Amino acid sequence: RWQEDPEPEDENLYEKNPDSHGYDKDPAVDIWNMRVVFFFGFSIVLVLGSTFVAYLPDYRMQEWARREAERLVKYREAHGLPIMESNCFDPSKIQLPE
């Protein structure tokens, strides 16, 4: 009917570049794209990122809370107090209705 270009044939990157990493037709650009993805993706973000996460300074106070709980359990048991009380807040500071 109209004047339209035919659908182009699918191009196999390996044909012209058997060493193609699949990033670019240009072999030099292709290699550099591979290197940045691998160096920044795996060497930097994943390895150093995993290391950074592994050594986070007591994430969200979990380790401090355990040390603090140990201190309170030690103190309360020695002085004969309950380990925990049902009332979070001192009743003398509360006024009830009615």
Partner: protein, 320 residues
């Protein structure tokens, strides 16, 4: 000061630069009528600017470096293909015709812009007023479809109505047997494939439709082939014309200012030559037009507006 309302206000009125020598002349005729040679002699003798007939590459001649561009940037219109295979399924026949009418429309605008800006008359070979004779010949011979003719008339209707007709129409009447003999002598292999029936169709349209129509509104001079050889007599005939017809008598500075604002803006000239009428002969798919447009922008001096192309030597782009 590029022409506009401000230039018009400050005194650039067309009637100032125009004279009784400021005339628009068109030479018409069948193929191989020596109308090209007559047109040059009239222009030389009357001191007018001559326009060679607008072909497939006329627009290229007016833009860029002026040299022709590859074929794909004219859509692949081939006059040679028209002769070899006038019935090709690719639609080359009407695509060429639609392109050529647009090329003539652009040329008519250039000629009118020259006449109105400088006051010097012009000589054209055929015009948008006579382009239809080839369309009629194409249709009657079955080269184009009825739908193509309808499209052509739609485009002509909204374009030709904007422009004044020629002052003088010159017709060189050569009979088809003599036309057919001059063609075989010219020795162009594709042109010799032209048939007398096609040539008779052009003649019939010229005499049946064109000349009667232009006679109402223009000065029509008809010469046989022999008489056209006497260019001095032809020029003599032109200079003794009364000019008592047509719309050129109704024009004034206000109307000619409106006309000049149109012809100088070429995109405004060509606006309706691309009306969205989806005729298969002239319709181009998105993938092709996208690809061709991208190649066009890569041609030398075409990526940017003229004067802003460093790749062809433009300077001071950062102060322009």
């Amino acid at each position: 000061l590029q022409y506009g309302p401000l230039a018009y206000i400050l005194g650039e009125k067309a009637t100032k630069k125009m004279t009784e020598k400021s005339k628009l002349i068109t030479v018409d005729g069948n193929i191989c009528s020596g109308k090209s040679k007559l047109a040059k002699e009239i222009a030389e003798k009357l001191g007018l600017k001559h326009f060679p007939e607008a072909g497939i590459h006329y627009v290229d001649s007016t833009t860029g470096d002026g040299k022709p561009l590859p074929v794909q940037f004219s859509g692949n219109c081939s006059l040679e293909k028209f002769y070899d295979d006038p019935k090709s399924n690719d639609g080359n026949s009407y695509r060429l015709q639609a392109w050529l009418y647009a090329s003539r429309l652009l040329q008519y605008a250039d000629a009118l812009e020259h006449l109105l800006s400088t006051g010097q008359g012009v000589v054209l070979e055929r015009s948008i007023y006579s382009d239809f004779v080839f369309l009629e010949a194409m249709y009657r011979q079955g080269f184009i479809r009825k739908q193509c003719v309808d499209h052509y008339n739609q485009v002509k209707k909204v374009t030709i109505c904007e422009y004044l007709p020629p002052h003088v129409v010159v017709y060189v009447d050569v009979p088809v047997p003599e036309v057919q003999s001059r063609i075989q002598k010219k020795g162009n292999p594709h042109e010799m494939k032209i048939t007398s029936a096609y040539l008779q169709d052009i003649e019939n349209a010229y005499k049946g439709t064109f000349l009667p129509e232009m006679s109402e509104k223009c000065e029509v001079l008809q010469y046989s082939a022999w008489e056209a050889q006497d260019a001095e007599k032809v020029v003599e005939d032109i200079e003794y014309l009364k000019y008592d017809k047509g719309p050129w008598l109704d024009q004034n500075d206000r109307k000619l200012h409106k006309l000049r604002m149109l012809v100088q803006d070429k995109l405004e000239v060509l606006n309706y030559t691309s009306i969205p009428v989806f005729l298969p002969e002239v319709t181009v798919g998105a993938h092709q037009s996208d690809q061709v447009f991208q190649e066009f922008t890569e041609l030398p001096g075409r990526k940017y507006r003229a004067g802003y192309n460093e790749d062809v030597g433009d300077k001071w782009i950062w102060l322009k």
